[PDB]
Design a protein around this ligand. Structure first.
Ligand SMILES: CCCCCCCCCCCCCCCCCC(=O)OC[C@H](COP(=O)([O-])OCC(O)COP(=O)([O-])OC[C@@H](COC(=O)CCCCCCCCCCCCCCCCC)OC(=O)CCCCCCCCCCCCCCCCC)OC(=O)CCCCCCCCCCCCCCCCC
Ligand SMILES: CCCCCCCCCCCCCCCCCC(=O)OC[C@H](COP(=O)([O-])OCC(O)COP(=O)([O-])OC[C@@H](COC(=O)CCCCCCCCCCCCCCCCC)OC(=O)CCCCCCCCCCCCCCCCC)OC(=O)CCCCCCCCCCCCCCCCC
Ligand SMILES: CCCCCCCCCCCCCCCCCC(=O)OC[C@H](COP(=O)([O-])OCC(O)COP(=O)([O-])OC[C@@H](COC(=O)CCCCCCCCCCCCCCCCC)OC(=O)CCCCCCCCCCCCCCCCC)OC(=O)CCCCCCCCCCCCCCCCC
Ligand SMILES: CCCCCCCCCCCCCCCCCC(=O)OC[C@H](COP(=O)([O-])OCC(O)COP(=O)([O-])OC[C@@H](COC(=O)CCCCCCCCCCCCCCCCC)OC(=O)CCCCCCCCCCCCCCCCC)OC(=O)CCCCCCCCCCCCCCCCC
Ligand SMILES: CCCCCCCCCCCCCCCCCC(=O)OC[C@H](COP(=O)([O-])OCC[N+](C)(C)C)OC(=O)CCCCCCCCCCCCCCCCC
Ligand SMILES: CCCCCCCCCCCCCCCCCC(=O)OC[C@H](COP(=O)([O-])OCC[N+](C)(C)C)OC(=O)CCCCCCCCCCCCCCCCC
Ligand SMILES: CCCCCCCCCCCCCCCCCC(=O)OC[C@H](COP(=O)([O-])OCC[N+](C)(C)C)OC(=O)CCCCCCCCCCCCCCCCC
Ligand SMILES: CCCCCCCCCCCCCCCCCC(=O)OC[C@H](COP(=O)([O-])OCC[N+](C)(C)C)OC(=O)CCCCCCCCCCCCCCCCC
Ligand SMILES: [Cu+2]
Lengths: 58, 53, 343, 49, 50, 63, 188, 67, 49, 126, 55, 49, 148, 56
């Protein structure tokens, strides 16, 4: 599961860094950015992250 | 109606092309371009082909 | 728990069947790193552009002996020659044991093969021998300068002079399987060719004799069958076709001396028949209209008569060769069909 | 492609080549593939696994 | 190679062959044997069991 | 057939046949094997129809 | 030139991009600037190492390519050793010593490549291999670059392994190609 | 067969070539033993020992170790 | 632009791979199929990218 | 007589094909790719269809040698043809007038080049 | 069950989204409503009033 | 070479005791292996330390 | 090599007047990083030339190579999906020009740019094929051509 | 050079034509295929003439 999900989180975090520093406006609604795209990308990994945390406990 | 016509034409085309093109086309596998009779050339599995031809 | 020991003993050999054979496909050095094919990522090993030699023989050596072999090339050559001699001895002993076993017991059975496959195998053997001879000649021509340096100057001068004489003021018209390169090779190696001409036709006849006398194509060892049939069925060819096959592959079933005797008898009878007046007239008529026949692909009566005489001569040759055979009825040769005559 | 044994075979690779060319049980067991081991019978006193 | 007739007769008299040779080397001809190449394997104590 | 045989001898007629033969000679291809088993493996694979005729497969009970 | 002069002028002496920089891109036209990128100066080790290793590799491979060719060859007194002069990295002379016994002219592994050898031509090159050092000596076939009284002995001594049997055996010499082995003649 | 004719060297050890066929020498010193033919191969043993020993695990080049 | 940055980093990686390979073969004195084919496949992958 | 042409199959369509004797009657005096591949195919077919093991093994060795020779010939052919193709490509693009008059609209984004929202991007009235 | 639900969601919401991507000269509103009806009228958020007495 | 005919006589339940008994077959002794090798093997030097 | 590299490094430092202490500290860290990363591979190459490079080791190295390239391919594929599904403003009024922005590049220009890579891969294949019957010195020409 | 190549082409063409026209006289070809073909052609001609005679 981690192998499946990690690249999505990596891409989302890299895009966040680019928006912060280079001002790529990936998540700026003014000129085409999608703020909800960041949430989608993060949670797509976030829920599998908690599932990964819990599954070994069983 | 178009489906009926198309499938009738497809069956007729199979019947016509059987002896006209594909069977003569099969004569090209009698020998290799070097003149030797056809023999098996495996890719990854050396299948046994003891059966004739 | 079986604690295997690093030794060669019957106790260890007792467990040979309890192991999978070691895979060779993953051994050696691979010229392909990894296959980028999701369809067979775990079904196919990496392919190889080159081939895998199979003429390798391995022998175990001690550490000090291996160090000696590495350090001393002379000792390495000596041990290698000794090992080759011992391998030859071992192979000869195995062959003799196999021959003794065959003599004592007998072959397991007859080989089910088609007559077409048999003929094609013989033809392929002849073609392989011819190609080997051609390759030997070409390699000799290519390596003449490096193998014979003392006479290279004179031989090259002679070859160049002859080639210039041929292609300076004249065209060279080649008949048969003769080419300018082959003529140059013959001119260069004139000396050696005198001792052993190695003529194409004579070599082909001798190699056919060798192939048929090797004994591998003896009809006694084969059960001829159609092959293409769903069920195993005997050969369905006509009686005339069977007789023609037997005559064509006479050498396969006959021994050297018996074949020599029968062939000498047949050739003497054929020579006498040709010396008979009718054949001389037929050949004279054949030669009379050679120029006319060259203007068209159609034949003339003087040639049709010659061909009919050829058919009769073939029938008589078969009869003469198989004269001393009780289980032979020659009446079948009387009033043959057109297809039988062609066969 | 086949390695020159007399020149480069030493220790581990030499033992692997020995297993390949002789199939002696010791070497074959040492270099047996981990993915698959030959299936055997069911262990018994008369015919133990 | 050539084997002396007396030696071969002595071998036949002393031992009677009743089993076939299993090694594929029995099929090798002289040409193949000559074309064969000899290689050496270094055999020593084995310490790695993997 | 008679007309074809009559025109066979003409050199102009045979020029096209010569060109066709030349193209056929230039149209040769090779088909190598690209597996580690290679020629020896293929040869052993093609031995199914002939293994039964070998001496080692003859019935010979040890006892 | 190609690696330093043109890149330097294109990178530092002008802020205007070249056509190959952006013809495949879809940005509006803009200029460059060397002082508003890579604040960490991470490109300094990259450029330095690339330059150093590229120069080293180029020079070393030039030397390797030129090593095979032989400039001068001299037999020692008694003709036991051969002193060979070869090209150095800067085109000067470098000395080496070889043994005539080790020196040998070997045929190619592939027997169909004999016709492709440069030695086939009258003014080609001869590839003599040192079987001890696994080195190759290249000599011009032209008679100009040869001493005409020590050439026959040299070629005879260095061309022993290129024999007639390299081309194969006919049916007259197939039997003699190997030495027959006698078994059991000395004892039963 | 084409046996090696003679060795014009004062070193009697080199005369071993005279006892072998040219084809044998090509097979075992030129085709597949080219890197091993008529060579000491002591460097092979030295490199084997260097590789198999437990020496310092800091390598700079194939020839030298890190300073 | 981000994809092209990734492509450039991959190309730098394969360039370093090739530099390492050439230096090692120069030191050894001969080329080897494993590393040579690895470099060839790296070139193919970079061409694809 | 339609059956005589439909249900009747030619003898060659069923029986094994023979050896083309014209392919071997006359051959050049050069040990070239054509002759090498002809010999390779002959030996391969003989190994496939032969019951004689003694002849096959020597044929196996000769076939390995022929495989090496054909690999060398193919390497030469590949080198020559690839070099010719690359040189032809380079010369074609050197002597070919590449069109440089394609539409450049894609490179222009007037709204993005000159922000049309102005100060409203940083925030509205209050 | 999840796959069938996802297939239905795709058929209703994903593929139809690409049918119209530019202004349409003729019957633009009609086509937009045609593509929107299948997605906005799914029974999941429509059915239930028939048994409203349950709650 | 009939497989069933061979097997029915080769493998039997009443011969189990002698079918799986390991032994050294009677073969002519070889000096290099059965005479010389044991002598050199037993003549190896022995060191206390 | 040393002359050119040192000159380039000093010029690039001087043009922007980097702080020496901080930059030298960073470059020391980077040097140690890269040096040890490459020294691991140097050790692997030096150790596997005798008695260590077995079939299992070769398969392991092939697997590592494919795994690395697979991870890189996965990351690049995620980025490629993001590129393909890049968001944009509504086409009706906000951005009406999006319809005519196809961003199509000329193949007549792409092929010439693509030529060098195919040249390199073909040269590499030729070197691989020719390694069976050629020496190191003779193939240095192909190696140098590929390097250039 | 050019003249030699042209003559070689002409020689090969002439040899091919001579073979096609007179291969039925000798046994160079295995199985005497051209000879059998010529014999079959004569047989067919004679059979056609005899068929006309028998119809009459
Ligand atoms: C409903 C449609 C839905 C999808 C939409 C439509 C399709 C869209 C396009 C799909 C394809 C992508 C486009 C490029 C295709 C290129 C094909 C090619 O060049 O290779 C053909 C290649 C055949 O060439 P070949 O190897 O030379 O031929 C055999 C030789 O004799 C080799 O000889 P040998 O000696 O080396 O080996 C001998 C032996 C071994 O050789 C092999 O073939 C090797 C083993 C092959 C195993 C294949 C299955 C395992 C796949 C592994 C993973 C693949 C990727 C998975 C990705 C998703 C992971 C989650 O031969 C065989 O066994 C041959 C069998 C091949 C038959 C294939 C027939 C079609 C499939 C049905 C198979 C049924 C089997 C029999 C049962 C019959 C029914 C009861 O492979 C096939 O034809 C089979 C491929 C099967 C896997 C397909 C995976 C597709 C992945 C992309 C999906 C895209 C998205 C789809 C929608 C979903 C979005 C989320
Ligand atoms: C309309 C469709 C087509 C449009 C094409 C438009 C043009 C695009 C050109 C772009 C490339 C430029 C030219 C490059 C030349 C390269 C030459 C070369 O040496 O390459 C041949 C080289 C020969 O292979 P080899 O290892 O030497 O020998 C194999 C044997 O011969 C055994 O032979 P085999 O045939 O059985 O197997 C080999 C086969 C294997 O290839 C195929 O069967 C694929 C054929 C269709 C290619 C389509 C190109 C891309 C088109 C746009 C994207 C559409 C979706 C594609 C989805 C399917 C994957 C392609 O190769 C071929 O089919 C030969 C032609 C391949 C052309 C180059 C393909 C570039 C692929 C780029 C993407 C790679 C990463 C994708 C990851 C998955 C993303 C969803 O193979 C490749 O390089 C092809 C690699 C393909 C990898 C596909 C991976 C699929 C995913 C599987 C794992 C999924 C895990 C999921 C985990 C997470 C789940 C949540
Ligand atoms: C419009 C639709 C398409 C058709 C037209 C195409 C364009 C025009 C083509 C014109 C060709 C014919 C020119 C007149 C020839 C007159 C010959 C002569 O005096 O009679 C000797 C001969 C009499 O001698 P005889 O001792 O009684 O019997 C000897 C036998 O015939 C046994 O003799 P044989 O048959 O073995 O003779 C072979 C012949 C030749 O030997 C060969 O068979 C070897 C192959 C040689 C080349 C053959 C083709 C040459 C023409 C085409 C070239 C195409 C190049 C393309 C280049 C690339 C373009 C992108 O020997 C020679 O005559 C030696 C000549 C060697 C030099 C050749 C070069 C000549 C100069 C080049 C320019 C030619 C005119 C160009 C006009 C403009 C074209 C645009 O004539 C006969 O056999 C009976 C007929 C006599 C009256 C003929 C009246 C004229 C009508 C002739 C029609 C021939 C048609 C052939 C083709 C049929 C379809 C496949
Ligand atoms: C302190 C930080 C660093 C400062 C460096 C300053 C610049 C120095 C340049 C020197 C260049 C080499 C000169 C060698 C001459 C001697 C050659 C010789 O005799 O051969 C022996 C041997 C080489 O043998 P060989 O047979 O000649 O080699 C031939 C091979 O084919 C050749 O193969 P190989 O030997 O090179 O093999 C080693 C292998 C192993 O790889 C390496 O060597 C790694 C190289 C890393 C370089 C990093 C440079 C960073 C600093 C840049 C400049 C700083 C400012 C400088 C000052 C201002 C400007 C003037 O190298 C590679 O293959 C590298 C591949 C290419 C990569 C290039 C660099 C990376 C580019 C891509 C990424 C760049 C962005 C960063 C990305 C990462 C971010 C985290 O050399 C050695 O063992 C080293 C030198 C001799 C021993 C040391 C003697 C002095 C004592 C040590 C003093 C310093 C340390 C202790 C200080 C404290 C004392 C108390
Ligand atoms: C955009 C630019 C283009 C891209 C540029 C980069 C291109 C890189 C090309 C090279 C690398 C990729 C090559 C193709 C892939 C090769 C894979 C491979 O060989 O790996 C074998 C590796 C190693 O295999 P191995 O080591 O056993 O291989 C040896 C095999 N034998 C022994 C037979 C020789 O293992 C695998 O990864 C295979 C098993 C896993 C495969 C994936 C299964 C699915 C996992 C997820 C579960 C499902 C989730 C839901 C999916 C559906 C969602 C909708
Ligand atoms: C790393 C390789 C192995 C692993 C493979 C996988 C790696 C994938 C990494 C990327 C993943 C996806 C995220 C992308 C992030 C991109 C970040 C980015 O763009 O930063 C770059 C940054 C730019 O960042 P920046 O902050 O300066 O950006 C400028 C923009 N503003 C002003 C808005 C901040 O640049 C560098 O890091 C410097 C790179 C220097 C390269 C030098 C190469 C020299 C070549 C020399 C040879 C050529 C000939 C000349 C020789 C002369 C010799 C004298
Ligand atoms: C072998 C027995 C076969 C039995 C026949 C039924 C199964 C056939 C095969 C499976 C597909 C079933 C699809 C049913 C729905 C088709 C239409 C559709 O999607 O829209 C209606 C509805 C959607 O309705 P709607 O909201 O779009 O309404 C359309 C009308 N307006 C717009 C006016 C409101 O589909 C769903 O709601 C799908 C929900 C997901 C779960 C569906 C489960 C179906 C029943 C269980 C099937 C189990 C099969 C097991 C097979 C293996 C074991 C035997
Ligand atoms: C700013 C730019 C980027 C900065 C980052 C710097 C990146 C540097 C990358 C260097 C890569 C060097 C690779 C060398 C591989 C050597 C393999 C070896 O030991 O040989 C095995 C062997 C060597 O074989 P051989 O040919 O030498 O000999 C075998 C032995 N005989 C000949 C006797 C039989 O090779 C193989 O098995 C072939 C396949 C090799 C596959 C190698 C994969 C390497 C993967 C590296 C991943 C790196 C990740 C980096 C992450 C990011 C870092 C910042
Ligand atoms: Cu959740």
């Amino acid at each position: 599961m981690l192998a499946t999900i990690t690249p999505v989180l990596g891409a989302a975090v890299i895009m966040m860094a680019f928006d912060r520093h280079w001002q790529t406006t990936f998540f700026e609604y003014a000129y085409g950015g999608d703020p909800i795209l960041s949430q989608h990308l993060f949670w797509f990994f976030g829920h599998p992250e908690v599932y990964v945390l819990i599954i070994p406990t069983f | 109606n178009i489906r009926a016509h198309f499938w009738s034409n497809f069956a007729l085309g199979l019947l016509i092309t059987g002896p006209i093109f594909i069977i003569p086309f099969g004569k090209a596998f009698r020998n290799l371009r070097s003149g030797v009779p056809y023999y098996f050339r495996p890719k990854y599995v050396f299948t046994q082909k003891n059966q004739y031809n | 728990l079986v604690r295997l020991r690093n030794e060669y003993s019957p106790e260890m050999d007792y467990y040979l069947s309890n192991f999978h054979p070691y895979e060779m496909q993953e051994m050696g050095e691979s010229d392909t790193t990894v296959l980028m094919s999701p369809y067979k990522y775990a079904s196919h090993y990496e392919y190889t552009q080159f081939e895998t030699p199979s003429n390798m023989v391995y022998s175990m050596v001690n550490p000090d002996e291996h160090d000696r072999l590495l350090v001393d090339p002379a000792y390495r050559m000596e041990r290698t020659k000794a090992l080759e001699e011992k391998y030859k001895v071992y192979t000869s002993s195995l062959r003799e044991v196999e021959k003794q076993f065959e003599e004592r017991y007998g072959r397991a059975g007859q080989i089910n093969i088609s007559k077409v496959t048999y003929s094609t195998l013989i033809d392929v053997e002849k073609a392989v021998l011819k190609m080997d001879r051609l390759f030997r000649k070409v390699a000799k021509f290519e390596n003449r300068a490096f193998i014979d340096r003392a006479n290279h100057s004179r031989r090259e001068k002679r070859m160049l002079e002859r080639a210039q004489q041929r292609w300076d003021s004249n065209y060279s018209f080649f008949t048969g399987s003769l080419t300018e390169e082959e003529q140059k090779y013959r001119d260069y190696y004139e000396t050696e060719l005198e001792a052993y001409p190695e003529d194409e036709g004579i070599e082909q006849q001798l190699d056919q004799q060798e192939v048929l006398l090797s004994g591998r194509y003896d009809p006694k060892l084969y059960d001829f069958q159609e092959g293409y049939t769903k069920n195993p069925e005997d050969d369905q060819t006509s009686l005339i076709e069977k007789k023609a096959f037997k005559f064509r592959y006479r050498l396969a079933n006959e021994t050297s001396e018996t074949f020599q005797r029968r062939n000498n008898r047949m050739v003497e009878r054929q020579i006498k028949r040709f010396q008979q007046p009718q054949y001389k007239h037929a050949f004279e008529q054949l030669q009379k209209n050679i120029a006319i026949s060259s203007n068209s692909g159609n034949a003339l009566h003087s040639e049709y008569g010659y061909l009919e005489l050829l058919s009769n001569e073939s029938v008589q040759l078969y009869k003469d060769y198989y004269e001393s055979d009780a289980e032979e009825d020659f009446k079948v040769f009387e009033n043959l069909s057109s297809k039988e005559k062609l066969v | 492609r086949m390695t020159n044994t007399t020149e480069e075979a030493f220790d581990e690779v030499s033992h692997e080549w020995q297993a390949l060319v002789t199939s002696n049980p010791f070497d074959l067991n040492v270099f047996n593939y981990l993915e698959n081991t030959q299936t055997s019978n069911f262990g018994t006193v008369d015919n133990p696994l | 190679t050539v084997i002396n007739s007396e030696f071969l007769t002595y071998l036949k008299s002393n031992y009677k062959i009743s089993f076939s040779a299993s090694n594929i080397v029995k099929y090798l001809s002289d040409k193949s044997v000559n074309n064969s190449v000899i290689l050496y394997l270094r055999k020593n104590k084995i310490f790695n069991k993997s | 057939l008679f007309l074809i045989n009559n025109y066979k001898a003409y050199k102009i007629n045979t020029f096209f046949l010569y060109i066709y033969i030349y193209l056929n000679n230039l149209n040769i291809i090779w088909y190598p094997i690209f597996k580690a088993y290679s020629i020896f493996g293929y040869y052993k694979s093609t031995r199914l129809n002939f293994i039964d005729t070998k001496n080692e497969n003859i019935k010979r009970i040890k006892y | 030139w190609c690696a330093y002069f043109v890149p330097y002028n294109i990178f530092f002496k002008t802020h205007m991009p070249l056509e190959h920089a952006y013809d495949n891109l879809f940005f509006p036209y803009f200029q460059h600037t060397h002082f508003l990128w890579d604040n960490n100066a991470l490109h300094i080790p990259t450029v330095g190492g690339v330059a150093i290793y590229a120069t080293y590799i180029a020079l070393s491979y030039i030397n390797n390519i030129w090593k095979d060719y032989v400039v001068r060859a001299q037999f020692s007194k008694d003709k036991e050793l051969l002193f060979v002069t070869r090209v150095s990295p800067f085109g000067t002379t470098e000395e080496e010593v070889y043994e005539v016994a080790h020196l040998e002219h070997l045929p190619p592994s592939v027997r169909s490549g004999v016709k492709d050898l440069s030695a086939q031509d009258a003014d080609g090159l001869v590839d003599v291999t040192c079987m001890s050092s696994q080195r190759s000596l290249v000599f011009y076939k032209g008679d100009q670059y040869w001493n005409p009284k020590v050439y026959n002995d040299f070629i005879n001594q260095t061309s022993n392994l290129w024999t007639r049997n390299y081309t194969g055996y006919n049916r007259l010499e197939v039997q003699n190609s190997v030495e027959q082995v006698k078994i059991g003649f000395s004892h039963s | 067969m084409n046996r090696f004719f003679k060795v014009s060297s004062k070193y009697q050890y080199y005369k071993y070539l005279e006892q072998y066929d040219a084809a044998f020498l090509r097979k075992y010193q030129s085709e597949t033993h080219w890197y091993l033919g008529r060579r000491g191969a002591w460097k092979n043993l030295v490199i084997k020992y260097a590789g198999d020993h437990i020496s310092l695990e800091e390598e700079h080049n194939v020839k030298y170790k890190t300073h | 632009a981000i994809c092209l940055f990734a492509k450039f980093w991959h190309f730098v990686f394969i360039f370093l791979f090739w530099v390492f390979f050439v230096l090692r073969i120069n030191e050894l004195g001969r080329i080897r199929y494993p590393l040579l084919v690895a470099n060839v496949q790296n070139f193919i992958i970079i061409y694809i990218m | 007589m339609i059956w005589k042409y439909l249900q009747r199959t030619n003898r060659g369509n069923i029986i094994q094909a023979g050896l083309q004797h014209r392919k071997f009657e006359n051959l050049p005096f050069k040990q070239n790719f054509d002759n090498l591949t002809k010999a390779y195919d002959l030996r391969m077919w003989y190994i496939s269809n032969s019951p004689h093991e003694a002849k096959n093994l020597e044929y196996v060795n000769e076939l390995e040698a022929l495989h090496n020779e054909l690999n060398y010939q193919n390497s030469r052919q590949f080198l020559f043809r690839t070099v010719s193709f690359l040189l032809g490509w380079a010369l074609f693009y050197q002597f070919y007038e590449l069109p440089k008059t394609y539409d450049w609209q894609d490179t222009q984004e007037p709204k993005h080049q000159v922000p049309a929202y102005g100060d409203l991007e940083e925030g509205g009235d209050e | 069950v999840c796959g069938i639900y996802v297939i239905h969601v795709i058929y209703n919401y994903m593929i139809p989204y690409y049918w119209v991507s530019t202004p349409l000269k003729n019957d633009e509103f009609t086509r937009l409503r045609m593509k929107d009806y299948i997605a906005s009228t799914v029974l999941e958020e429509v059915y239930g009033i028939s048994y409203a007495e349950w709650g | 070479s009939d497989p069933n005919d061979f097997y029915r006589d080769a493998y039997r339940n009443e011969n189990r005791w002698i079918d799986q008994s390991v032994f050294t077959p009677k073969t002519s002794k070889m000096t290099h292996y059965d005479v010389e090798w044991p002598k050199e093997l037993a003549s190896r030097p022995v060191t206390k330390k | 090599g040393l002359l050119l590299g040192l000159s380039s490094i000093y010029y690039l430092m001087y043009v922007r007047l980097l702080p020496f202490n901080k930059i030298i500290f960073a470059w020391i860290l980077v040097a140690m990083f890269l040096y040890w990363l490459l020294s691991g591979f140097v050790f692997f190459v030096k150790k596997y030339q005798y008695s260590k490079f077995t079939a299992a080791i070769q398969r392991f190295w092939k697997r590592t190579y494919i795994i690395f390239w697979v991870i890189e391919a996965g990351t690049f594929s995620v980025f490629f999906y993001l590129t393909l599904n890049a968001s944009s403003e509504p086409v009706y009024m906000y951005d009406q020009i999006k319809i005519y922005k196809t961003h199509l590049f000329s193949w007549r220009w792409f092929l010439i740019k693509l030529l060098p890579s195919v040249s390199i891969i073909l040269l590499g294949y030729y070197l691989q094929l020719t390694l069976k019957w050629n020496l190191f010195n003779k193939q240095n020409t192909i190696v140098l051509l590929i390097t250039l | 050079a050019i003249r030699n190549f042209v003559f070689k082409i002409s020689n090969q063409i002439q040899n091919l034509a001579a073979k096609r026209s007179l291969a039925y006289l000798n046994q160079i070809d295995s199985q005497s295929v051209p000879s059998r073909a010529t014999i079959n052609m004569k047989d067919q001609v004679t059979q056609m003439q005899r068929e006309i005679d028998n119809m009459a």
